[PDB]
Amino acid sequence: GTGETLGEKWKARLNQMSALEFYSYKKSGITEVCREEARRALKDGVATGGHAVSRGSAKLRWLVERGYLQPYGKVIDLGCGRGGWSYYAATIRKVQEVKGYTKGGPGHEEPVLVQSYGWNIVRLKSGVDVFHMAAEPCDTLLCDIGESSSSPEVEEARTLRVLSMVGDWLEKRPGAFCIKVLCPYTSTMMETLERLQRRYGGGLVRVPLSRNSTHEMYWVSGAKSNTIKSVSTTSQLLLGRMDGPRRPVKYEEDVNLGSGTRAV
Ligand SMILES: Nc1ncnc2c1ncn2[C@@H]1O[C@H](CSCC[C@H](N)C(=O)O)[C@@H](O)[C@H]1O
Protein backbone atom coordinates (compact mmCIF):
# COMPACT_ATOMS: atom_id res chain seq x y z
CA GLY A 1 0.00 0.00 0.00
CA THR A 2 1.21 3.46 -1.02
CA GLY A 3 -0.94 5.38 1.46
CA GLU A 4 -3.16 8.30 0.54
CA THR A 5 -4.12 9.05 -3.05
CA LEU A 6 -4.52 12.60 -4.35
CA GLY A 7 -8.29 12.16 -4.33
CA GLU A 8 -8.27 11.19 -0.67
CA LYS A 9 -6.25 14.35 0.08
CA TRP A 10 -8.76 16.35 -1.96
CA LYS A 11 -11.69 14.92 0.02
CA ALA A 12 -9.98 15.54 3.37
CA ARG A 13 -9.31 19.18 2.43
CA LEU A 14 -12.88 19.55 1.19
CA ASN A 15 -14.23 18.34 4.54
CA GLN A 16 -12.06 20.94 6.32
CA MET A 17 -13.63 23.87 4.45
CA SER A 18 -16.02 26.29 6.08
CA ALA A 19 -19.44 26.65 4.50
CA LEU A 20 -18.17 29.88 2.94
CA GLU A 21 -14.99 28.30 1.55
CA PHE A 22 -16.99 25.29 0.34
CA TYR A 23 -19.52 27.56 -1.40
CA SER A 24 -16.89 29.58 -3.28
CA TYR A 25 -14.88 26.47 -4.18
CA LYS A 26 -17.85 24.42 -5.43
CA LYS A 27 -18.25 26.31 -8.72
CA SER A 28 -14.82 27.94 -9.05
CA GLY A 29 -13.80 27.85 -12.71
CA ILE A 30 -16.34 25.21 -13.73
CA THR A 31 -18.52 25.16 -16.84
CA GLU A 32 -22.24 25.68 -16.35
CA VAL A 33 -25.43 26.08 -18.35
CA CYS A 34 -27.71 28.91 -17.37
CA ARG A 35 -31.01 27.32 -16.31
CA GLU A 36 -33.05 30.52 -15.84
CA GLU A 37 -35.14 30.24 -19.02
CA ALA A 38 -35.80 26.52 -18.56
CA ARG A 39 -36.68 26.86 -14.88
CA ARG A 40 -39.20 29.60 -15.71
CA ALA A 41 -40.78 27.77 -18.66
CA LEU A 42 -41.03 24.48 -16.74
CA LYS A 43 -42.71 26.28 -13.82
CA ASP A 44 -45.19 27.76 -16.30
CA GLY A 45 -45.96 24.26 -17.62
CA VAL A 46 -44.46 24.91 -21.07
CA ALA A 47 -43.77 21.52 -22.66
CA THR A 48 -42.92 22.50 -26.27
CA GLY A 49 -40.18 25.09 -25.78
CA GLY A 50 -37.19 22.77 -26.27
CA HIS A 51 -36.04 23.15 -22.66
CA ALA A 52 -34.11 20.43 -20.89
CA VAL A 53 -35.74 19.20 -17.69
CA SER A 54 -32.46 19.27 -15.71
CA ARG A 55 -28.76 20.12 -15.92
CA GLY A 56 -28.21 16.47 -16.84
CA SER A 57 -29.03 16.96 -20.52
CA ALA A 58 -26.04 19.29 -20.88
CA LYS A 59 -23.76 16.82 -19.09
CA LEU A 60 -24.70 14.04 -21.51
CA ARG A 61 -24.50 16.43 -24.47
CA TRP A 62 -20.88 17.20 -23.54
CA LEU A 63 -19.98 13.50 -23.75
CA VAL A 64 -22.03 12.74 -26.86
CA GLU A 65 -20.88 15.74 -28.93
CA ARG A 66 -17.28 14.63 -28.43
CA GLY A 67 -17.93 11.02 -29.40
CA TYR A 68 -17.16 9.69 -25.92
CA LEU A 69 -20.60 8.03 -26.00
CA GLN A 70 -22.53 7.12 -29.20
CA PRO A 71 -26.08 6.10 -28.19
CA TYR A 72 -28.10 3.84 -30.46
CA GLY A 73 -31.08 1.48 -30.47
CA LYS A 74 -32.80 0.66 -27.17
CA VAL A 75 -31.58 2.98 -24.38
CA ILE A 76 -32.03 2.03 -20.72
CA ASP A 77 -31.56 4.94 -18.30
CA LEU A 78 -31.11 3.74 -14.70
CA GLY A 79 -31.72 6.45 -12.11
CA CYS A 80 -33.33 8.78 -14.64
CA GLY A 81 -34.56 11.38 -12.14
CA ARG A 82 -36.42 14.14 -13.95
CA GLY A 83 -35.29 12.63 -17.25
CA GLY A 84 -32.50 14.87 -18.57
CA TRP A 85 -30.48 12.00 -20.02
CA SER A 86 -33.53 10.19 -21.40
CA TYR A 87 -34.85 13.23 -23.25
CA TYR A 88 -31.40 14.00 -24.64
CA ALA A 89 -30.99 10.41 -25.82
CA ALA A 90 -34.39 10.57 -27.53
CA THR A 91 -33.11 13.24 -29.95
CA ILE A 92 -30.22 11.09 -31.22
CA ARG A 93 -30.77 9.71 -34.72
CA LYS A 94 -29.60 6.14 -34.06
CA VAL A 95 -31.68 5.87 -30.85
CA GLN A 96 -35.05 4.15 -31.28
CA GLU A 97 -36.49 3.70 -27.77
CA VAL A 98 -35.72 5.17 -24.33
CA LYS A 99 -36.82 3.53 -21.07
CA GLY A 100 -35.95 5.43 -17.88
CA TYR A 101 -36.39 4.18 -14.31
CA THR A 102 -36.09 6.10 -11.07
CA LYS A 103 -36.96 5.71 -7.40
CA GLY A 104 -38.92 8.92 -6.87
CA GLY A 105 -40.58 9.55 -3.53
CA PRO A 106 -39.99 12.17 -0.83
CA GLY A 107 -36.78 14.07 -1.39
CA HIS A 108 -36.02 12.51 -4.78
CA GLU A 109 -36.44 13.69 -8.35
CA GLU A 110 -39.65 12.68 -10.13
CA PRO A 111 -39.84 12.29 -13.93
CA VAL A 112 -40.93 15.46 -15.74
CA LEU A 113 -43.22 15.13 -18.77
CA VAL A 114 -42.26 17.46 -21.63
CA GLN A 115 -42.57 17.16 -25.39
CA SER A 116 -39.01 17.78 -26.56
CA TYR A 117 -38.03 16.11 -29.83
CA GLY A 118 -38.65 12.37 -29.72
CA TRP A 119 -40.78 12.46 -26.56
CA ASN A 120 -43.07 9.79 -28.05
CA ILE A 121 -40.29 7.15 -27.82
CA VAL A 122 -39.58 7.92 -24.15
CA ARG A 123 -41.14 6.11 -21.19
CA LEU A 124 -40.12 7.21 -17.69
CA LYS A 125 -41.11 5.07 -14.70
CA SER A 126 -40.97 6.27 -11.09
CA GLY A 127 -41.31 4.16 -7.97
CA VAL A 128 -38.65 1.71 -9.20
CA ASP A 129 -35.69 0.51 -7.13
CA VAL A 130 -33.21 -0.36 -9.88
CA PHE A 131 -31.21 -2.61 -7.53
CA HIS A 132 -34.18 -5.01 -7.54
CA MET A 133 -34.73 -4.82 -11.32
CA ALA A 134 -33.78 -7.88 -13.35
CA ALA A 135 -31.27 -6.90 -16.02
CA GLU A 136 -32.44 -7.12 -19.62
CA PRO A 137 -30.66 -6.66 -22.96
CA CYS A 138 -30.30 -3.19 -24.38
CA ASP A 139 -28.10 -1.40 -26.87
CA THR A 140 -27.16 1.64 -24.77
CA LEU A 141 -26.91 1.46 -20.97
CA LEU A 142 -27.01 4.71 -18.95
CA CYS A 143 -26.74 5.07 -15.19
CA ASP A 144 -26.39 8.34 -13.27
CA ILE A 145 -26.75 6.96 -9.72
CA GLY A 146 -24.44 7.97 -6.91
CA GLU A 147 -25.34 10.35 -4.09
CA SER A 148 -22.53 12.49 -2.66
CA SER A 149 -21.51 12.08 0.99
CA SER A 150 -18.97 13.80 3.21
CA SER A 151 -17.92 10.28 4.27
CA PRO A 152 -15.55 8.66 1.75
CA GLU A 153 -16.45 5.21 3.11
CA VAL A 154 -20.09 5.96 2.25
CA GLU A 155 -19.16 7.21 -1.22
CA GLU A 156 -17.06 4.08 -1.76
CA ALA A 157 -19.85 1.77 -0.58
CA ARG A 158 -22.34 3.57 -2.83
CA THR A 159 -20.03 3.38 -5.85
CA LEU A 160 -19.33 -0.34 -5.37
CA ARG A 161 -23.09 -0.85 -5.21
CA VAL A 162 -23.66 0.96 -8.53
CA LEU A 163 -20.81 -0.92 -10.21
CA SER A 164 -22.01 -4.32 -9.00
CA MET A 165 -25.51 -3.57 -10.27
CA VAL A 166 -24.46 -2.27 -13.70
CA GLY A 167 -22.22 -5.30 -14.22
CA ASP A 168 -25.35 -7.45 -14.54
CA TRP A 169 -26.62 -5.17 -17.32
CA LEU A 170 -23.25 -4.98 -19.08
CA GLU A 171 -23.21 -8.80 -19.12
CA LYS A 172 -26.08 -8.52 -21.64
CA ARG A 173 -23.60 -6.75 -24.00
CA PRO A 174 -24.86 -3.24 -24.74
CA GLY A 175 -22.53 -1.64 -27.26
CA ALA A 176 -22.64 1.81 -25.66
CA PHE A 177 -22.70 2.77 -22.00
CA CYS A 178 -22.29 5.77 -19.70
CA ILE A 179 -22.02 5.02 -15.96
CA LYS A 180 -21.52 7.52 -13.16
CA VAL A 181 -18.59 6.61 -10.91
CA LEU A 182 -19.17 8.76 -7.82
CA CYS A 183 -15.90 7.90 -6.07
CA PRO A 184 -13.19 6.64 -8.46
CA TYR A 185 -10.02 7.50 -6.60
CA THR A 186 -9.29 4.94 -3.87
CA SER A 187 -6.72 2.26 -4.67
CA THR A 188 -9.35 -0.45 -4.25
CA MET A 189 -11.77 1.35 -6.56
CA MET A 190 -9.13 1.89 -9.23
CA GLU A 191 -8.24 -1.81 -9.23
CA THR A 192 -11.96 -2.61 -9.55
CA LEU A 193 -12.39 -0.18 -12.43
CA GLU A 194 -9.44 -1.61 -14.35
CA ARG A 195 -10.83 -5.13 -13.92
CA LEU A 196 -14.16 -3.86 -15.29
CA GLN A 197 -12.39 -2.20 -18.24
CA ARG A 198 -10.65 -5.46 -19.08
CA ARG A 199 -14.05 -7.17 -19.33
CA TYR A 200 -16.26 -4.39 -20.74
CA GLY A 201 -13.93 -1.71 -22.18
CA GLY A 202 -14.43 2.04 -21.93
CA GLY A 203 -12.66 4.59 -19.78
CA LEU A 204 -13.39 7.31 -17.24
CA VAL A 205 -13.98 10.94 -18.25
CA ARG A 206 -14.27 14.08 -16.14
CA VAL A 207 -17.05 16.36 -17.42
CA PRO A 208 -16.25 20.07 -16.87
CA LEU A 209 -19.88 20.75 -15.92
CA SER A 210 -19.33 18.69 -12.76
CA ARG A 211 -18.93 20.77 -9.60
CA ASN A 212 -15.56 20.87 -7.81
CA SER A 213 -17.24 19.47 -4.69
CA THR A 214 -17.59 16.00 -6.25
CA HIS A 215 -14.96 13.72 -7.79
CA GLU A 216 -17.56 12.05 -10.07
CA MET A 217 -16.32 10.71 -13.40
CA TYR A 218 -18.24 8.92 -16.12
CA TRP A 219 -17.27 5.46 -17.35
CA VAL A 220 -18.07 5.66 -21.08
CA SER A 221 -17.66 3.12 -23.87
CA GLY A 222 -16.29 5.62 -26.39
CA ALA A 223 -13.25 6.95 -24.48
CA LYS A 224 -10.85 4.18 -23.45
CA SER A 225 -7.96 5.43 -21.34
CA ASN A 226 -5.60 4.61 -18.49
CA THR A 227 -7.78 4.99 -15.39
CA ILE A 228 -4.83 5.45 -13.01
CA LYS A 229 -3.83 8.48 -15.06
CA SER A 230 -7.31 9.84 -15.81
CA VAL A 231 -8.35 9.75 -12.14
CA SER A 232 -5.06 11.27 -10.98
CA THR A 233 -5.36 14.07 -13.55
CA THR A 234 -8.82 14.92 -12.19
CA SER A 235 -7.57 14.86 -8.58
CA GLN A 236 -4.74 17.25 -9.48
CA LEU A 237 -7.20 19.54 -11.26
CA LEU A 238 -9.53 19.66 -8.25
CA LEU A 239 -6.69 20.20 -5.77
CA GLY A 240 -5.23 23.05 -7.83
CA ARG A 241 -8.57 24.84 -7.81
CA MET A 242 -8.49 24.82 -3.99
CA ASP A 243 -5.62 27.34 -4.14
CA GLY A 244 -5.65 30.90 -5.39
CA PRO A 245 -8.73 33.08 -5.78
CA ARG A 246 -12.14 31.90 -6.86
CA ARG A 247 -12.32 31.85 -10.63
CA PRO A 248 -15.25 32.77 -12.90
CA VAL A 249 -17.82 30.23 -14.00
CA LYS A 250 -17.77 29.59 -17.75
CA TYR A 251 -21.48 29.90 -18.58
CA GLU A 252 -22.89 28.18 -21.68
CA GLU A 253 -26.33 28.32 -23.24
CA ASP A 254 -28.36 25.28 -22.24
CA VAL A 255 -29.45 22.50 -24.53
CA ASN A 256 -32.27 23.07 -26.99
CA LEU A 257 -33.96 19.69 -27.47
CA GLY A 258 -36.52 21.01 -29.96
CA SER A 259 -40.03 19.61 -30.13
CA GLY A 260 -42.11 17.19 -32.16
CA THR A 261 -42.38 13.44 -32.51
CA ARG A 262 -40.16 10.86 -34.18
CA ALA A 263 -41.27 8.22 -36.68
CA VAL A 264 -40.75 4.73 -35.23
N1 LIG B 1 -32.14 2.60 -5.99
C1 LIG B 1 -32.52 3.50 -6.90
N2 LIG B 1 -33.43 3.13 -7.88
C2 LIG B 1 -33.84 4.05 -8.82
N3 LIG B 1 -33.34 5.33 -8.80
C3 LIG B 1 -32.44 5.69 -7.85
C4 LIG B 1 -32.01 4.79 -6.89
N4 LIG B 1 -31.12 5.44 -6.09
C5 LIG B 1 -30.99 6.72 -6.54
N5 LIG B 1 -31.81 6.87 -7.63
C6 LIG B 1 -32.07 8.06 -8.45
O1 LIG B 1 -31.08 8.31 -9.41
C7 LIG B 1 -31.19 9.66 -9.81
C8 LIG B 1 -29.77 10.13 -10.11
S1 LIG B 1 -29.72 11.86 -10.62
C9 LIG B 1 -30.26 11.57 -12.31
C10 LIG B 1 -30.20 12.85 -13.13
C11 LIG B 1 -30.50 12.56 -14.59
N6 LIG B 1 -29.35 11.91 -15.24
C12 LIG B 1 -30.92 13.81 -15.34
O2 LIG B 1 -30.29 14.12 -16.36
O3 LIG B 1 -31.86 14.52 -14.97
C13 LIG B 1 -31.85 10.41 -8.65
O4 LIG B 1 -33.08 11.02 -9.06
C14 LIG B 1 -32.11 9.33 -7.61
O5 LIG B 1 -33.33 9.50 -6.93
Numbering used by the authors: 3 to 266
Q: What sentences appear in the manuscript?
A:
ZIKV nonstructural protein 5(NS5) is a multi-domain protein, which has an N-terminal methyltransferase domain (MTase) and a C-terminal RNA dependent RNA polymerase (RDRP) domain. The MTase can sequentially methylate guanine N-7 and ribose 2′-O to form m7NGpppA2′Om cap structure in the new RNA transcripts. The methylation starts with transferring the methyl group from the donor S-adenosylmethionine (SAM) to the methyl acceptor and then leaves the S-adenosylhomocysteine (SAH) as a byproduct. Defects in MTase are lethal for flaviviruses, which makes MTase a potential target for rational drug design against flaviviruses.
Here, we present the 1.76 Å crystal structure of ZIKV MTase in complex with the byproduct SAH, providing insight into the elegant methylation process, which will benefit the following antiviral drug development. The MTase forms a well-defined 3D structure consisting of nine α-helixes (cyan, α1-α9), nine β-strands (magenta, β1-β9), and multiple loop regions. Together, the α4-α8, β2-β8, and interspersed loops form the Rossman fold, which is a protein structural motif that binds nucleotides. In this structure, the byproduct SAH binds in the pocket of the N-terminal portion of the Rossman fold, which is primarily surrounded by α4-α6, β2, β3, β5, and adjacent loop regions. In the complex structure, SAH is stabilized by hydrogen bond network formed between the ligand and the adjacent residues. Among them, H110, E111, V130, and D131 form the hydrogen bonds with the adenosyl group of SAH; S56, W87, and D146 form the hydrogen bonds with the homocysteine group of SAH. Furthermore, the side chains of F133, V132, and I147 can stack together with the base of SAH to enhance hydrophobic interactions. However, we found that the size of the substrate/byproduct-binding pocket decreases dramatically upon converting SAM to SAH. The binding pocket was closed mainly through two gatekeeper residues: E149 and H110. Taken together, both the SAM/SAH binding pocket and the 7-MeGpp binding channel decreased in size upon converting SAM to SAH during catalysis.
